Amino acid sequence: GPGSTLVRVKKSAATLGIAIEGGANTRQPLPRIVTIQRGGSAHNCGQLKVGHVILEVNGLTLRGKEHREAARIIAEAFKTKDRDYIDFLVTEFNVML
């Protein structure tokens, strides 16, 4: 939908190197990227930014996922050996509901 971008992040480093905040039943109902660390996979990619809201991970919606579950989905997506990237559907819009 308008405002969303699919970003494929290569697993170029040993971590993703982002911090995320939010998840279901919080004021930030979909997770927001709050930091991008130098040296991590996300910094290397150049396509993810502080403020991006993550809508889907590898095609799985994060809507309805509590913060701990969303984070675990992303961690498991980074750890898997099935592929050498993670697909994030992100938006630059604020998401408030």
Partner: peptide
């Protein structure tokens, strides 16, 4: 430069 501006659009 990996930072978005405040957004002027919000999903409700």
């Amino acid at each position: 430069r990996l930072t978005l501006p405040p957004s002027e659009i919000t999903l409700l």
